[PDB]
CSV table of C-alpha atoms and ligand atoms in Angstrom, one decimal:
chain,number,residue,atom,x,y,z
O,1,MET,CA,0.0,0.0,0.1
O,2,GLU,CA,1.2,3.5,-0.7
O,3,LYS,CA,1.9,6.1,2.0
O,4,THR,CA,-1.4,8.3,1.6
O,5,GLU,CA,-3.5,5.2,1.8
O,6,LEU,CA,-1.4,3.8,4.9
O,7,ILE,CA,-2.1,7.1,6.5
O,8,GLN,CA,-5.9,7.1,5.8
O,9,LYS,CA,-5.9,3.7,7.2
O,10,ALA,CA,-4.1,4.5,10.1
O,11,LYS,CA,-6.2,7.4,10.8
O,12,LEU,CA,-9.1,5.4,10.4
O,13,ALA,CA,-7.9,2.5,12.6
O,14,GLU,CA,-7.0,5.4,15.2
O,15,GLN,CA,-10.7,6.5,15.1
O,16,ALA,CA,-11.9,2.9,15.5
O,17,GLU,CA,-9.4,2.5,18.4
O,18,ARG,CA,-8.0,-0.5,16.4
O,19,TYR,CA,-4.2,0.2,17.5
O,20,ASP,CA,-2.8,-3.0,16.2
O,21,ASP,CA,-4.0,-2.1,12.9
O,22,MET,CA,-2.8,1.6,13.2
O,23,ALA,CA,0.8,0.2,14.3
O,24,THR,CA,1.1,-1.7,11.3
O,25,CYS,CA,0.3,1.0,9.2
O,26,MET,CA,2.9,3.4,10.2
O,27,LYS,CA,5.4,0.5,10.7
O,28,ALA,CA,4.6,-0.1,7.2
O,29,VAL,CA,5.1,3.8,6.5
O,30,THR,CA,8.5,3.8,8.2
O,31,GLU,CA,9.9,0.8,6.6
O,32,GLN,CA,9.7,2.4,3.1
O,33,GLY,CA,12.8,4.5,4.3
O,34,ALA,CA,11.4,7.9,4.0
O,35,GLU,CA,11.2,10.7,7.0
O,36,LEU,CA,8.1,11.3,8.9
O,37,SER,CA,6.1,14.4,9.1
O,38,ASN,CA,5.2,15.8,12.7
O,39,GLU,CA,1.6,14.0,12.1
O,40,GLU,CA,3.2,10.9,10.8
O,41,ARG,CA,5.6,10.8,14.0
O,42,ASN,CA,2.5,11.5,16.3
O,43,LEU,CA,0.5,8.6,14.6
O,44,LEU,CA,3.4,6.1,15.0
O,45,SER,CA,3.8,7.4,18.7
O,46,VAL,CA,0.2,7.1,19.4
O,47,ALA,CA,-0.3,3.6,17.8
O,48,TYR,CA,2.4,1.9,19.4
O,49,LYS,CA,1.8,3.7,23.0
O,50,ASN,CA,-1.8,1.9,22.9
O,51,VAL,CA,-0.6,-1.1,21.8
O,52,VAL,CA,1.9,-1.8,24.6
O,53,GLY,CA,-0.1,0.2,27.3
O,54,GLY,CA,-2.6,-2.6,27.6
O,55,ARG,CA,0.3,-5.0,28.2
O,56,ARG,CA,1.8,-2.5,30.8
O,57,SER,CA,-1.7,-2.3,32.5
O,58,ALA,CA,-2.1,-5.9,32.5
O,59,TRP,CA,1.3,-6.8,33.8
O,60,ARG,CA,0.9,-4.4,36.8
O,61,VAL,CA,-2.3,-5.8,37.7
O,62,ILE,CA,-1.0,-9.3,37.3
O,63,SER,CA,2.5,-8.6,39.2
O,64,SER,CA,0.0,-6.8,41.9
O,65,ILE,CA,-2.1,-10.1,42.3
O,66,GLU,CA,1.3,-12.3,42.4
O,67,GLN,CA,2.6,-10.2,45.4
O,68,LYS,CA,-0.4,-10.4,47.3
O,69,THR,CA,-0.3,-14.6,46.5
O,70,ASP,CA,1.2,-16.8,49.3
O,71,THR,CA,4.5,-18.2,48.4
O,72,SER,CA,3.1,-21.4,49.3
O,73,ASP,CA,-0.1,-21.4,47.2
O,74,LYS,CA,-0.1,-23.8,44.7
O,75,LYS,CA,-2.0,-21.5,42.3
O,76,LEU,CA,1.2,-19.3,42.3
O,77,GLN,CA,3.0,-20.7,39.2
O,78,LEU,CA,-0.1,-20.0,37.0
O,79,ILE,CA,0.1,-16.5,38.0
O,80,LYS,CA,3.8,-16.3,37.2
O,81,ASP,CA,3.4,-18.2,33.6
O,82,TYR,CA,0.5,-15.7,32.9
O,83,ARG,CA,2.8,-12.6,34.0
O,84,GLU,CA,5.6,-14.1,31.7
O,85,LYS,CA,3.3,-14.4,28.9
O,86,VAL,CA,2.3,-10.7,29.1
O,87,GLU,CA,6.2,-9.9,29.8
O,88,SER,CA,6.9,-11.5,26.4
O,89,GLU,CA,4.3,-9.5,24.4
O,90,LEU,CA,5.3,-6.6,26.0
O,91,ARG,CA,9.3,-7.0,25.0
O,92,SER,CA,8.1,-8.0,21.4
O,93,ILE,CA,6.4,-4.8,21.2
O,94,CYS,CA,9.4,-2.8,22.4
O,95,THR,CA,11.7,-4.6,20.1
O,96,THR,CA,9.8,-3.8,17.2
O,97,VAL,CA,9.6,-0.1,18.2
O,98,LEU,CA,13.3,0.1,19.2
O,99,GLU,CA,14.2,-1.6,15.8
O,100,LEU,CA,12.1,1.0,13.8
O,101,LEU,CA,13.9,3.7,15.8
O,102,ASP,CA,17.5,2.4,15.3
O,103,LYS,CA,17.2,1.3,11.7
O,104,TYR,CA,15.0,4.0,10.3
O,105,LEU,CA,13.8,6.9,12.2
O,106,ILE,CA,16.9,8.0,14.5
O,107,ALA,CA,19.4,7.4,11.6
O,108,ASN,CA,17.5,9.5,9.1
O,109,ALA,CA,16.2,12.3,11.0
O,110,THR,CA,17.3,15.8,9.8
O,111,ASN,CA,16.5,18.4,12.6
O,112,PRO,CA,17.1,18.1,16.0
O,113,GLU,CA,13.4,18.4,16.9
O,114,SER,CA,12.8,14.9,15.1
O,115,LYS,CA,15.9,13.4,16.7
O,116,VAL,CA,15.0,14.5,20.2
O,117,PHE,CA,11.3,13.0,19.5
O,118,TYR,CA,13.0,9.6,18.4
O,119,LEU,CA,15.3,9.5,21.3
O,120,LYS,CA,12.7,10.3,23.8
O,121,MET,CA,10.7,7.2,22.4
O,122,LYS,CA,13.9,5.1,22.5
O,123,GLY,CA,14.4,6.0,26.2
O,124,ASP,CA,10.3,5.6,26.7
O,125,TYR,CA,10.4,1.9,25.3
O,126,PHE,CA,13.7,0.9,27.1
O,127,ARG,CA,11.9,2.2,30.1
O,128,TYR,CA,9.2,-0.1,29.7
O,129,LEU,CA,11.4,-2.9,29.2
O,130,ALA,CA,12.9,-2.0,32.3
O,131,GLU,CA,9.6,-2.0,34.3
O,132,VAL,CA,9.5,-5.7,33.9
O,133,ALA,CA,13.2,-6.7,33.6
O,134,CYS,CA,15.2,-8.1,36.7
O,135,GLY,CA,18.8,-8.3,36.9
O,136,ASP,CA,21.2,-7.7,34.5
O,137,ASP,CA,18.6,-7.3,31.9
O,138,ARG,CA,17.1,-4.5,34.1
O,139,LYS,CA,20.6,-2.7,34.5
O,140,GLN,CA,21.1,-2.8,30.5
O,141,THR,CA,17.8,-1.6,29.8
O,142,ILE,CA,18.0,1.4,32.3
O,143,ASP,CA,21.3,2.0,30.9
O,144,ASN,CA,20.1,2.3,27.3
O,145,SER,CA,17.1,4.1,28.4
O,146,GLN,CA,19.0,7.1,30.3
O,147,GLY,CA,21.4,7.0,27.5
O,148,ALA,CA,18.5,7.8,25.0
O,149,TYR,CA,17.1,10.4,27.2
O,150,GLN,CA,20.3,12.1,28.1
O,151,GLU,CA,21.2,12.7,24.4
O,152,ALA,CA,17.6,13.8,23.7
O,153,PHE,CA,17.9,16.3,26.6
O,154,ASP,CA,21.2,17.9,25.5
O,155,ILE,CA,20.1,18.3,22.1
O,156,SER,CA,16.8,19.9,23.0
O,157,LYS,CA,18.8,22.2,25.3
O,158,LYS,CA,21.0,22.9,22.6
O,159,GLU,CA,18.5,23.5,19.8
O,160,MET,CA,15.0,23.9,21.1
O,161,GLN,CA,13.2,26.7,23.2
O,162,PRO,CA,12.2,25.6,26.5
O,163,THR,CA,8.4,26.1,25.6
O,164,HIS,CA,8.5,23.6,22.7
O,165,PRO,CA,6.0,20.7,23.5
O,166,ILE,CA,8.6,18.0,22.4
O,167,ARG,CA,11.6,19.2,24.8
O,168,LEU,CA,8.7,19.6,27.3
O,169,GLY,CA,7.3,16.0,27.1
O,170,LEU,CA,11.0,14.9,27.0
O,171,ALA,CA,11.5,16.3,30.4
O,172,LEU,CA,8.1,14.8,31.6
O,173,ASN,CA,9.1,11.3,30.7
O,174,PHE,CA,12.7,11.8,31.8
O,175,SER,CA,11.7,13.1,35.0
O,176,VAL,CA,9.4,9.9,35.5
O,177,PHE,CA,12.3,7.8,34.6
O,178,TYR,CA,14.1,9.5,37.5
O,179,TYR,CA,11.2,8.7,39.9
O,180,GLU,CA,10.1,5.4,39.0
O,181,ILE,CA,13.2,3.9,37.6
O,182,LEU,CA,16.1,5.4,39.2
O,183,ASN,CA,14.0,6.0,42.6
O,184,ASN,CA,15.4,9.4,42.7
O,185,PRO,CA,12.4,11.6,43.7
O,186,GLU,CA,14.5,14.6,44.5
O,187,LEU,CA,16.3,14.8,41.0
O,188,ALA,CA,12.9,13.9,39.4
O,189,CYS,CA,11.3,16.9,40.9
O,190,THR,CA,14.1,19.2,40.0
O,191,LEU,CA,13.9,18.0,36.5
O,192,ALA,CA,10.6,18.6,36.2
O,193,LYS,CA,10.2,22.1,38.2
O,194,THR,CA,13.2,23.3,36.0
O,195,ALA,CA,11.5,22.3,32.5
O,196,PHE,CA,8.2,23.8,33.9
O,197,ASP,CA,9.7,27.2,35.2
O,198,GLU,CA,12.0,27.6,32.1
O,199,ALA,CA,8.7,27.1,30.0
O,200,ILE,CA,6.7,29.7,31.7
O,201,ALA,CA,9.0,32.5,30.1
O,202,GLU,CA,8.6,32.0,26.5
O,203,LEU,CA,4.8,31.6,26.5
O,204,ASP,CA,4.1,34.7,25.1
O,205,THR,CA,5.7,33.4,21.6
O,206,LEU,CA,3.5,30.5,21.0
O,207,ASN,CA,0.6,30.3,18.7
O,208,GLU,CA,-2.9,28.7,19.4
O,209,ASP,CA,-1.6,25.0,18.7
O,210,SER,CA,1.7,25.0,20.4
O,211,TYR,CA,0.3,26.9,23.3
O,212,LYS,CA,-2.4,24.3,23.9
O,213,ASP,CA,0.1,21.4,23.7
O,214,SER,CA,2.5,23.2,25.7
O,215,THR,CA,0.3,24.1,28.6
O,216,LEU,CA,-1.1,20.7,28.5
O,217,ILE,CA,2.4,19.3,29.2
O,218,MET,CA,3.3,21.8,31.7
O,219,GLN,CA,0.2,21.0,33.8
O,220,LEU,CA,1.2,17.5,33.8
O,221,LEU,CA,4.6,18.4,35.1
O,222,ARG,CA,2.7,20.2,37.6
O,223,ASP,CA,0.8,17.2,38.7
O,224,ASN,CA,3.6,15.2,39.0
O,225,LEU,CA,5.3,17.6,41.3
O,226,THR,CA,2.1,17.9,43.5
O,227,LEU,CA,1.8,14.0,43.7
O,228,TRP,CA,5.7,13.5,44.3
O,229,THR,CA,5.7,16.3,47.1
O,230,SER,CA,3.0,14.6,49.1
E,5,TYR,CA,-0.1,6.9,38.7
E,6,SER,CA,2.8,9.3,37.4
E,7,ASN,CA,1.9,11.3,34.2
E,8,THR,CA,3.9,10.5,30.9
E,9,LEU,CA,3.3,11.3,27.0
E,10,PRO,CA,1.6,10.1,24.8
E,11,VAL,CA,-1.2,8.6,26.8
E,12,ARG,CA,-3.2,5.5,26.0
E,13,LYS,CA,-6.8,6.0,25.3
V,1,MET,CA,-5.8,-27.1,31.3
V,2,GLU,CA,-8.4,-28.3,34.0
V,3,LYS,CA,-11.3,-26.7,34.9
V,4,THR,CA,-10.3,-25.0,38.3
V,5,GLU,CA,-7.0,-23.5,36.6
V,6,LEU,CA,-9.0,-22.1,33.7
V,7,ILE,CA,-11.4,-20.4,35.8
V,8,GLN,CA,-8.4,-19.1,38.1
V,9,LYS,CA,-7.0,-18.1,34.6
V,10,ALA,CA,-10.2,-16.6,33.6
V,11,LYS,CA,-10.6,-14.3,36.6
V,12,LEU,CA,-6.8,-13.5,36.5
V,13,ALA,CA,-7.4,-12.4,32.9
V,14,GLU,CA,-10.6,-10.4,33.9
V,15,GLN,CA,-8.7,-8.5,36.2
V,16,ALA,CA,-6.2,-7.8,33.8
V,17,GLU,CA,-9.0,-6.7,31.2
V,18,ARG,CA,-7.2,-9.2,28.9
V,19,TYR,CA,-10.7,-10.4,27.5
V,20,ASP,CA,-9.4,-12.4,24.5
V,21,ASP,CA,-7.5,-14.6,27.1
V,22,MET,CA,-10.9,-14.7,29.4
V,23,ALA,CA,-12.9,-15.8,26.4
V,24,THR,CA,-10.5,-18.4,25.6
V,25,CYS,CA,-10.4,-19.8,29.1
V,26,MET,CA,-14.2,-19.9,29.3
V,27,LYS,CA,-14.6,-21.3,25.9
V,28,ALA,CA,-12.1,-24.2,27.0
V,29,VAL,CA,-14.2,-24.7,30.2
V,30,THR,CA,-17.6,-25.0,28.1
V,31,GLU,CA,-16.2,-27.4,25.7
V,32,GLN,CA,-15.2,-29.6,28.9
V,33,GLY,CA,-19.2,-30.4,28.7
V,34,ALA,CA,-20.2,-29.7,32.3
V,35,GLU,CA,-22.8,-27.5,32.9
V,36,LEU,CA,-21.9,-23.8,34.1
V,37,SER,CA,-22.5,-22.5,37.2
V,38,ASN,CA,-24.0,-19.0,37.5
V,39,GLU,CA,-20.4,-17.6,38.4
V,40,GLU,CA,-19.0,-19.4,35.4
V,41,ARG,CA,-22.0,-18.2,33.1
V,42,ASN,CA,-21.2,-14.7,34.2
V,43,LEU,CA,-17.5,-14.8,33.5
V,44,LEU,CA,-18.4,-16.6,29.8
V,45,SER,CA,-20.7,-13.8,29.2
V,46,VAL,CA,-18.6,-10.9,30.5
V,47,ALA,CA,-15.8,-12.4,28.4
V,48,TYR,CA,-17.4,-12.5,25.1
V,49,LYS,CA,-19.3,-9.3,25.6
V,50,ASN,CA,-16.1,-7.4,25.8
V,51,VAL,CA,-14.5,-9.3,23.1
V,52,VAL,CA,-17.1,-8.3,20.7
V,53,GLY,CA,-18.1,-5.0,21.9
V,54,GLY,CA,-14.5,-3.8,20.5
V,55,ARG,CA,-15.5,-4.8,16.9
V,56,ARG,CA,-19.2,-3.3,17.6
V,57,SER,CA,-17.7,0.1,18.5
V,58,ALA,CA,-15.1,0.1,15.8
V,59,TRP,CA,-17.7,-1.1,13.0
V,60,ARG,CA,-20.0,2.0,14.3
V,61,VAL,CA,-17.3,4.4,13.9
V,62,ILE,CA,-16.0,3.3,10.5
V,63,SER,CA,-19.8,3.1,9.0
V,64,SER,CA,-20.7,6.3,10.3
V,65,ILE,CA,-17.4,7.7,8.4
V,66,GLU,CA,-18.5,5.5,5.4
V,67,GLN,CA,-22.1,7.1,5.4
V,68,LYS,CA,-20.5,10.6,5.6
V,69,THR,CA,-18.1,10.0,2.6
V,70,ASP,CA,-19.1,11.2,-0.9
V,71,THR,CA,-20.0,8.2,-2.9
V,72,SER,CA,-17.7,9.1,-5.9
V,73,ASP,CA,-14.7,9.7,-3.3
V,74,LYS,CA,-11.6,7.7,-4.3
V,75,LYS,CA,-10.8,7.2,-0.4
V,76,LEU,CA,-14.5,5.5,0.1
V,77,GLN,CA,-13.4,2.1,-1.2
V,78,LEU,CA,-10.6,1.7,1.2
V,79,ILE,CA,-13.0,2.9,4.2
V,80,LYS,CA,-15.4,0.2,3.1
V,81,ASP,CA,-13.0,-2.5,3.1
V,82,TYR,CA,-12.0,-1.7,6.6
V,83,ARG,CA,-15.5,-1.8,7.6
V,84,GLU,CA,-15.7,-5.4,5.8
V,85,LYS,CA,-12.8,-6.8,7.9
V,86,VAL,CA,-14.2,-5.6,11.1
V,87,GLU,CA,-17.5,-6.9,10.2
V,88,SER,CA,-15.9,-10.4,9.5
V,89,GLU,CA,-14.4,-10.3,12.9
V,90,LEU,CA,-17.7,-9.6,14.7
V,91,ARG,CA,-19.3,-12.4,12.7
V,92,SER,CA,-16.6,-14.9,13.7
V,93,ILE,CA,-16.8,-13.8,17.6
V,94,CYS,CA,-20.6,-14.0,17.1
V,95,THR,CA,-20.4,-17.6,15.4
V,96,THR,CA,-18.0,-18.8,18.0
V,97,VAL,CA,-20.3,-17.8,20.8
V,98,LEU,CA,-23.5,-19.3,19.1
V,99,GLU,CA,-21.6,-22.6,18.5
V,100,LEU,CA,-20.9,-22.7,22.3
V,101,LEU,CA,-24.6,-22.2,23.0
V,102,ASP,CA,-25.9,-24.8,20.5
V,103,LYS,CA,-23.4,-27.6,21.0
V,104,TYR,CA,-22.8,-27.1,24.9
V,105,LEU,CA,-24.6,-24.5,26.9
V,106,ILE,CA,-28.5,-24.8,25.5
V,107,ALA,CA,-27.8,-28.8,25.1
V,108,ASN,CA,-26.9,-29.5,28.5
V,109,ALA,CA,-28.9,-26.8,30.7
V,110,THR,CA,-30.9,-28.5,33.2
V,111,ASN,CA,-32.8,-25.7,34.6
V,112,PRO,CA,-34.9,-23.0,33.3
V,113,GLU,CA,-32.7,-20.2,34.6
V,114,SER,CA,-29.9,-21.4,32.5
V,115,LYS,CA,-32.0,-21.9,29.5
V,116,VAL,CA,-33.4,-18.4,29.5
V,117,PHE,CA,-29.7,-17.0,30.3
V,118,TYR,CA,-28.2,-18.9,27.2
V,119,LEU,CA,-31.5,-18.1,24.9
V,120,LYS,CA,-31.1,-14.6,25.8
V,121,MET,CA,-27.4,-14.7,24.7
V,122,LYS,CA,-28.6,-16.6,21.5
V,123,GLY,CA,-30.7,-13.5,20.8
V,124,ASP,CA,-28.1,-11.1,21.8
V,125,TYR,CA,-25.4,-12.4,19.5
V,126,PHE,CA,-27.8,-12.8,16.7
V,127,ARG,CA,-28.9,-9.2,17.3
V,128,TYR,CA,-25.3,-8.1,17.0
V,129,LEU,CA,-25.2,-10.1,13.5
V,130,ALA,CA,-28.4,-8.2,12.3
V,131,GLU,CA,-26.8,-4.9,13.2
V,132,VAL,CA,-24.5,-5.6,10.4
V,133,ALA,CA,-26.5,-7.8,8.0
V,134,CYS,CA,-28.0,-6.6,4.7
V,135,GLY,CA,-30.5,-8.0,2.4
V,136,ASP,CA,-31.9,-11.5,2.6
V,137,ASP,CA,-29.2,-12.3,5.1
V,138,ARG,CA,-30.7,-9.7,7.4
V,139,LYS,CA,-34.2,-11.2,7.4
V,140,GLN,CA,-33.3,-14.6,8.2
V,141,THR,CA,-30.6,-13.4,11.0
V,142,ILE,CA,-33.5,-11.0,12.6
V,143,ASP,CA,-35.8,-14.2,12.8
V,144,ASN,CA,-32.9,-16.1,14.2
V,145,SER,CA,-32.5,-13.1,17.0
V,146,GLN,CA,-36.4,-12.8,17.4
V,147,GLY,CA,-37.0,-16.7,18.0
V,148,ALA,CA,-34.4,-17.2,20.5
V,149,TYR,CA,-35.7,-14.0,22.4
V,150,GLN,CA,-39.2,-15.1,22.3
V,151,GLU,CA,-38.6,-18.5,23.5
V,152,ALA,CA,-36.6,-17.2,26.2
V,153,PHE,CA,-39.2,-14.6,27.1
V,154,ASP,CA,-41.7,-17.4,27.4
V,155,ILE,CA,-39.9,-19.4,29.6
V,156,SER,CA,-39.0,-16.6,31.7
V,157,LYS,CA,-42.5,-15.7,32.3
V,158,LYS,CA,-43.5,-19.3,33.0
V,159,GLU,CA,-40.6,-20.3,35.3
V,160,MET,CA,-39.5,-17.0,37.0
V,161,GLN,CA,-40.4,-14.3,39.2
V,162,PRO,CA,-40.8,-10.9,37.4
V,163,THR,CA,-38.2,-9.5,39.7
V,164,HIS,CA,-35.5,-12.2,38.6
V,165,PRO,CA,-32.5,-10.2,37.2
V,166,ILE,CA,-32.2,-12.5,34.3
V,167,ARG,CA,-35.7,-12.2,33.4
V,168,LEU,CA,-35.5,-8.3,33.7
V,169,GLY,CA,-32.3,-8.5,31.7
V,170,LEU,CA,-33.9,-10.3,28.9
V,171,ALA,CA,-36.7,-7.8,28.7
V,172,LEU,CA,-34.3,-5.0,28.7
V,173,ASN,CA,-32.6,-6.5,25.9
V,174,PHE,CA,-35.4,-7.9,23.7
V,175,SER,CA,-37.0,-4.3,24.1
V,176,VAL,CA,-34.0,-3.0,22.6
V,177,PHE,CA,-34.4,-5.6,19.8
V,178,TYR,CA,-37.6,-4.4,19.0
V,179,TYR,CA,-36.6,-0.5,19.0
V,180,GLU,CA,-33.3,-0.8,17.0
V,181,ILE,CA,-33.8,-3.9,14.8
V,182,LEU,CA,-37.5,-3.9,14.2
V,183,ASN,CA,-37.9,-0.3,14.5
V,184,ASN,CA,-41.0,-0.5,16.5
V,185,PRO,CA,-40.3,2.0,19.6
V,186,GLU,CA,-44.0,1.8,20.6
V,187,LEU,CA,-43.7,-2.4,21.0
V,188,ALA,CA,-40.3,-1.6,22.6
V,189,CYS,CA,-41.7,0.7,25.3
V,190,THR,CA,-44.6,-1.4,26.0
V,191,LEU,CA,-42.2,-4.4,26.5
V,192,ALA,CA,-39.9,-2.6,28.8
V,193,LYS,CA,-42.9,-0.9,30.7
V,194,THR,CA,-44.7,-4.3,31.5
V,195,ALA,CA,-41.4,-5.7,32.9
V,196,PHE,CA,-40.9,-2.6,35.0
V,197,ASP,CA,-44.4,-2.4,36.3
V,198,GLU,CA,-44.6,-6.2,37.0
V,199,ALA,CA,-41.2,-6.0,38.9
V,200,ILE,CA,-42.1,-3.0,41.1
V,201,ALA,CA,-45.3,-4.9,42.2
V,202,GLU,CA,-43.1,-7.4,43.8
V,203,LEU,CA,-39.9,-5.6,44.9
V,204,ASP,CA,-40.8,-5.2,48.6
V,205,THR,CA,-40.5,-8.9,49.1
V,206,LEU,CA,-36.7,-9.3,48.2
V,207,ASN,CA,-33.8,-9.0,50.6
V,208,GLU,CA,-31.9,-5.8,50.1
V,209,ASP,CA,-29.3,-7.7,48.0
V,210,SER,CA,-31.7,-8.9,45.4
V,211,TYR,CA,-33.5,-5.7,45.7
V,212,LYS,CA,-30.3,-4.0,44.7
V,213,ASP,CA,-29.7,-6.3,41.6
V,214,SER,CA,-33.4,-5.9,40.6
V,215,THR,CA,-33.6,-2.2,41.2
V,216,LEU,CA,-30.4,-1.7,38.9
V,217,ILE,CA,-31.8,-3.3,35.9
V,218,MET,CA,-35.4,-1.8,36.3
V,219,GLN,CA,-33.7,1.6,36.3
V,220,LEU,CA,-32.1,0.6,33.1
V,221,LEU,CA,-35.4,-0.2,31.6
V,222,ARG,CA,-36.9,3.1,32.7
V,223,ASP,CA,-33.6,4.7,31.5
V,224,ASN,CA,-34.7,3.4,27.9
V,225,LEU,CA,-38.2,4.5,28.4
V,226,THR,CA,-37.0,8.1,29.1
V,227,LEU,CA,-34.7,8.1,25.9
V,228,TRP,CA,-37.4,6.4,23.6
V,229,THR,CA,-40.3,8.7,24.8
V,230,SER,CA,-38.4,12.2,24.0
Q,5,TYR,CA,-27.5,4.1,22.6
Q,6,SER,CA,-29.9,2.2,24.4
Q,7,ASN,CA,-29.1,0.4,27.6
Q,8,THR,CA,-28.4,-3.5,27.1
Q,9,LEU,CA,-26.9,-6.1,29.7
Q,10,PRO,CA,-24.0,-7.1,30.2
Q,11,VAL,CA,-22.0,-4.0,29.3
Q,12,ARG,CA,-18.5,-3.5,28.0
Q,13,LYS,CA,-15.9,-2.7,30.9
Z,1,MG,MG1,10.3,-12.1,33.3
Z,2,MG,MG1,-13.8,-5.3,-0.5
Z,3,MG,MG1,-21.1,-7.2,4.5
């Protein structure tokens, strides 16, 4: 299928909440080798976030039930097996996304805003891998997540204004990485609050769409700070 | 839960 | 997998909102051939309602877009093809459920309550097929839905108290069949109204748990009446 | 739409 038809179908699949189809479409668009538009990057991101999200939410529920299960309960191994099945699906989704990023998206990116978007995404899906990993796999996934986030952070500080929604969304997720993965709430708070404060200044220069996006992100930063400071 | 972007539907 | 593990896995899947897995488990339980308990019946019903609901909602979205699109639009063929894929998935699900009902659940049911529950389900899933059917196919599919509903209705009137939640839920769905499939709002209103009135007449003889159960469905009957009489 | 039982979650 050609690009234009794949995008029409991806948007149709999005409206129908058929995110597997949407992800397959945007995956096909990417593997054709051409650089994605902002619209198309967003379609890819929304698609795979919804695909992986159902596994992440299921995993949290299953692991929670496993923790409350008596270690001697003869039903325990069934729970563990189901958890591992969900984990296996989640890895496959993350591997697919990360491969798309390293083989097509990151390599072919031309402007720093796109490269920040893809490096952020790489940090996100290595972070999802790290949420369910243990031992050495955990150490390596945390390391790959942090490295992607840090490079994206440095580029965004160098090339983009603090009110830019992509830099702000990077700060949002990177601060969550510090809070939940590195278990450093103090640095997580400073990362979020620094990005929030520095964005306040340049708000008088954004147009409608950018203002709505940036303000939405800033509110999420403030929500996380409220949650983490109480 | 901690908020991240994008959000799933 | 043995029945006890299947039920455990089905409940774990329900908590994780992995309804495909939940349905697969309850299909395996059903195919073992033993009658289902009321709890197992509810698990089966909840699982397949969630599995089919995803396709129903997607179909409604796609078909609304198809109707809004200009018939000469080159984009229309893609929209139509996508709707047809969702339709095929919806039909597969309904066919699996109806096969379970015919081969196992109705065939082995040993009491009128279970028979009414399964004939209602037969009516429900034939009704989902009717929503997407066209032409002669539609006439027969509507007939199949109506015949299941009517038999369930007669049994329930003979064998069950007017406040029984299964009898009330049957009246609710049967009245929607009249409204949405047969396009007769007057008969739909009278069906729901009769069921409601005959129930209030006997509410005060229930314990508070059963009063809660019946009241909830009665409110749904009144909700529909209010919608339809506006 | 009209109310039917069971419901999606
Ligand atoms: Mg594991
Ligand atoms: Mg076709
Ligand atoms: Mg058709």
